[PDB]
Design a protein around this nucleic acid. Structure first.
Ligand SMILES: *O[C@H]1[C@@H](O)[C@H](n2cnc3c(N)ncnc32)O[C@@H]1COP(=O)(O)OP(=O)(O)OP(=O)(O)OC[C@H]1O[C@@H](n2c[n+](C)c3c(=O)[nH]c(N)nc32)[C@H](O)[C@@H]1O
Ligand SMILES: [Mg+2]
Ligand SMILES: [Mg+2]
Lengths: 51, 737, 102
RNA sequence: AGUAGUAACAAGAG
RNA sequence: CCUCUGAAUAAACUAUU
RNA sequence: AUCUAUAAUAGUUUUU
């Protein structure tokens, strides 16, 4: 099998949820440093290119 | 003095001072990679483009003072234009080839020492011996092998620490070489490198090439030793094997491992023979390990292993009834046991099988720095007496004895992320994994083992889970003494008698070893093993045995078919099926035999139903003494690398699959050949070699009601037709003879 | 040494471990001896109350410099007590050599 | 013109 | 006219050192 | 019997 447009349908928010579930019962600093990445990726911008 | 003057000069300037002041040691690494950019994306295209230029090479300015600007014919060798982002100049390959023919000559006598490994490769190739080339059916297996042997008892981090200590004594940070091997190697290399005159960095790289061990996953056949893996491209092919022996010196541990593997294979294949002793003798006399006859090694090699001892006893040599475990030499003084596969649940919620030995037994353990006497029962440590040198030795002996006892307390003490499979999903030995886990830290093991008051007898000291010498209570069943050694008698090879069925007995008459005590593990050899006989696959691994058995049946299908039709009694007794019979589970062999034979009889009673594939598939299973029964088998198992792989009676299977479009047989993914069609084949869609007392008539017939399972066919009578769910999701109408 | 010592003495040719204790000296000395697990490293412990301890009751320096250290410790303690900062500074010694990631 | 193919080259810059 | 220049995505793995 | 040490370079795999 192949999955059509895998990366255009996966959402950063679901990765945030998965990380939150994985890091349960862990120190808060670890959870924050892991959670920053999905937070930054759900507010990302795209450069258009040369023109 | 030069360093400090240059530092002062740099600090005088502004940009250099700012760089040196604002930059930490950590950021020195970042600025070291700092660059404007290496705009190279196609190195091959760029090289082809550049080689057409006049001056593609870069050289230091010293070249202007050492090589003339032009050669005899006036061709320019270099120019004064600098390379952007540096001060080096541009030069032509003509300069390189002019230097190679007219440059000053030096003394390159120490290069073989700096690059000793490659010249050692050259020497090994030079003195190697080439044998014949054999065309066969190669079965390469993907395994981890070693490409850089390095040092025997060292790892990557330890080797790097040793290199740092030897070459950079003041840069070792906080590391201290605690292992005895590391200290000994460091002293030896410092003695060797005493008063060395080679640059420290190159000495570090030399020591890296000499000491660091490197391993990789490769598809290998034959030996997995470093010397045999460097020439793997030459010795093994897709259809051929080249006999070759490296010309260097062979390590003793590799010889021991190869001998153990060969002895285990030989004994396992000999047990299934009608006269095991003669078969074992001839197999030993027809086997070589790394170009050396096996008998010579058996004479001059002191290895403690069951199969090796059986081989020695067959050859009339004195043996030792000892084996190895956890680095200790165990020797059963009394008692007996039987192996049994028992499923257990690990402390960290893992389910695994273990080979539990039942019965009561007494052993004596001898170690390089410890000694003990052990008495145990089935998964129960009756008592242990340890007389080690210091606390560490006694702790190690205690851990080894605890793991050896197969105690449930030991199993439940497993914690953390301990895995019982390889990174490639290959099974690992549970006992070795437990030993490695508990040797790192046994605090939980000791805490959960238990405590018990002691009787204070003979002055033997106690021991607590904290590893301290108590006198009131100690670890359950464990005692610490000082006068227990009895080490000389360990190396006391005794004269023994070997029975026809490979039962080693003492002079008194007590049984010491038997084939049942040999390990069932199917390992691989460090040195290549060569077997000379009609069947060069007689003592090979399971996959090779299977593929070659079916290939032999296919190749000789004419006379085999005639013999099966006429005189089946002699066909089942072929010597070719015995290696296959070794793979079948013992307790099942007879049963399977019976089953298969009955099918063949029916296949002869009912004419017009002659499927070649069925006979070829089931023939190897009829080589054992039959045991009559009424059981119905839908598949027959074979032990491959510790897993029970099934062969389905009807239809294709993962192991044995036949393709009608190409008329080709595949065994474990290897092509065993193409069957040749016979005019006598029954082209009527009727199968008479699937069920023990039933004949498959056709596809599903809804008249006779819903289908029923295979095991529920015992209720039928003569002439009754019924639908059966025999096969992979297939329902067929059958009748009972 | 197994751990970084504070000073090295060439005259005695030995590593010296220095400690400043806000509690009683003996408990701190026992803690340091347990941690380092050595007998070749000279240990010298001071306190803000003027107390002192050392290995084998050996004091490498003369009494003048020891008195100078004692008066410096007393002066700093007095300064801290004037501002009322001494109570926590004494109560925070136990949780001092620990890393709390933030 | 030609290469080529979802956008470019068929010299660019100072 | 003259001077210079011919173009380096992420992750994992493989090989060599 | 186990076997993921680091860093450099190149090659391969990962489309509505
Ligand atoms: O490389 C493999 C093997 O070739 C190598 N090896 C074995 N022997 C030597 C010697 N003598 N020198 C150098 N190298 C040697 O070590 C590797 C072993 O591989 P593997 O086949 O997986 O191990 P094995 O199958 O032999 O089982 P193992 O756990 O090592 O047990 C060794 C030995 O101890 C017997 N044994 C275990 N237990 C719990 C026993 C018991 O309770 N009662 C009795 N009587 N025996 C017990 C094992 O069955 C083996 O006999
Ligand atoms: Mg796919
Ligand atoms: Mg300190």
């Amino acid at each position: 099998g192949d999955n059509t447009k895998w990366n255009e349908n996966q959402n950063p928010r679901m990765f945030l949820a998965m990380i939150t579930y994985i890091t349960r019962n862990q120190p808060e600093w670890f959870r924050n440093v892991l959670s920053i990445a999905p937070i930054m990726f759900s507010n990302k911008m795209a450069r258009l290119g040369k023109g | 003095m030069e360093r400090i003057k240059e530092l002062r000069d740099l600090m005088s300037q502004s940009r250099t001072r700012e760089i040196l002041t604002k930059t930490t040691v950590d950021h020195m690494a970042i600025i070291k990679k700092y660059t404007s950019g290496r705009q190279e994306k196609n190195p091959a295209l760029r090289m082809k483009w550049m080689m057409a230029m006049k001056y593609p090479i870069t050289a230091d300015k010293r070249i202007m003072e050492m090589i003339p600007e032009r050669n005899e014919q006036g061709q320019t060798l270099w120019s004064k234009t600098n390379d952007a982002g540096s001060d080096r100049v541009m030069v032509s390959p003509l300069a390189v080839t002019w230097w190679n023919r007219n440059g000053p000559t030096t003394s390159t006598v120490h290069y073989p020492k700096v690059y000793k490994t490659y010249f050692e490769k050259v020497e090994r190739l030079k003195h190697g011996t080439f044998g014949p080339v054999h065309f066969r059916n190669q079965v390469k297996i993907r395994r981890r092998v070693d490409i850089n042997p390095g040092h025997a008892d060292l790892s990557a981090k330890e080797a790097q620490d040793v290199i740092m200590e030897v070459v950079f004594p003041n840069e070792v940070g906080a590391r201290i070489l605690t292992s005895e091997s590391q200290l000994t190697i460091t002293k030896e290399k410092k003695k060797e490198l005493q008063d060395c005159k080679i640059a420290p960095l190159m000495v570090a790289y030399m020591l890296e090439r000499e000491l660091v061990r490197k391993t990789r996953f490769l598809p290998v056949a034959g030996g997995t030793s470093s010397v045999y893996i460097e020439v793997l491209h030459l010795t093994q092919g897709t259809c051929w094997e080249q006999m070759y022996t490296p010309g260097g010196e062979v390590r003793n541990d590799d010889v021991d491992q190869s001998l153990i593997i060969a002895a285990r294979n030989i004994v396992r294949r000999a047990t299934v023979s009608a006269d095991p002793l003669a078969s074992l003798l001839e197999m030993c006399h027809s086997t070589q390990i790394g170009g050396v006859r096996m008998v010579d090694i058996l004479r001059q090699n002191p290895t403690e292993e069951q199969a090796v001892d059986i081989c020695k006893a067959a050859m009339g040599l004195r043996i030792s009834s000892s084996f190895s475990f956890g680095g200790f030499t165990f020797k059963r003084t009394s008692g007996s046991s039987v192996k049994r596969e028992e499923e257990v649940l690990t402390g960290n919620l893992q389910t695994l099988k273990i080979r539990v030995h039942e019965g009561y037994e007494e052993f004596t353990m001898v170690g390089r720095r410890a000694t003990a006497i052990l008495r145990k029962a089935t998964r129960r440590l009756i008592q242990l007496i340890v007389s080690g040198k210091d606390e560490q030795s006694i702790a190690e002996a205690i851990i080894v004895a605890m793991v050896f006892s197969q105690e449930d307390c030991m199993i439940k003490a497993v914690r953390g992320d301990l895995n019982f499979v390889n990174r490639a999903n290959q099974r690992l030995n549970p006992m070795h994994q437990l030993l490695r886990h508990f040797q790192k830290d046994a605090k939980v093991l000791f805490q959960n083992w238990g405590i018990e008051p002691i009787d204070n007898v003979m002055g033997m000291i106690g021991i607590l889970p904290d590893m301290t010498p108590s006198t009131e209570m100690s670890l359950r069943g464990v005692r610490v003494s000082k006068m227990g050694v009895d080490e000389y008698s360990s190396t006391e090879r005794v004269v023994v008698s070997i029975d026809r069925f490979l039962r080693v007995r003492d002079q008194r008459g007590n049984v010491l070893l038997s084939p049942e005590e040999v390990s069932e593990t199917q390992g691989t050899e460090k040195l290549t093993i060569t077997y000379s006989s009609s069947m060069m696959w007689e003592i090979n691994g399971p996959e090779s045995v299977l593929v070659n058995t079916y290939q032999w049946i296919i190749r000789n299908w004419e006379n085999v078919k005639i013999q099966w039709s006429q005189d089946p009694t002699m066909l089942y007794n072929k010597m070719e099926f015995e290696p296959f019979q070794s793979l079948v589970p013992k307790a099942a062999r007879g049963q399977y035999s019976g089953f298969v034979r009955v099918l063949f009889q029916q296949m002869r009673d009912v004419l017009g139903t002659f499927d070649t594939v069925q006979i070829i598939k089931l023939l190897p299973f009829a080589a054992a003494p039959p045991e009559q029964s009424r059981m119905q088998f839908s598949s027959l198992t074979v032990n491959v690398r510790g897993s029970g792989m099934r062969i389905v009676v009807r239809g294709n299977s993962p192991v044995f699959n036949y393709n009608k479009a190409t008329k080709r047989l595949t065994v474990l993914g290897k092509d065993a050949g193409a069957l040749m069609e016979d005019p006598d084949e029954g082209t009527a869609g009727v199968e008479s070699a699937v069920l023990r007392g039933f004949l498959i008539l056709g596809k599903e017939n809804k008249r006779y009601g819903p289908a029923l399972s295979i095991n529920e066919l015992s209720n039928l009578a003569k002439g009754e037709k019924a639908n059966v769910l025999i096969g992979q999701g297939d329902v067929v109408l059958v009748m009972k003879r | 040494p197994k751990f970084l010592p504070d000073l090295y003495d060439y005259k005695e040719n030995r590593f010296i471990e220095i400690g400043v204790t806000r509690r009683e000296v003996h408990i701190y000395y026992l803690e340091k001896a347990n941690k380092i697990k050595s007998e070749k490293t000279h240990i010298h412990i001071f306190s803000f109350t003027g107390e002192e301890m050392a290995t084998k009751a050996d004091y490498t320096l003369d009494e003048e410099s020891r008195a100078r250290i004692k008066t410096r410790l007393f002066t700093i303690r007095q300064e801290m007590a004037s501002r009322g900062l001494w109570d926590s500074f004494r109560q925070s010694e136990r949780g001092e050599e620990t890393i709390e990631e933030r």
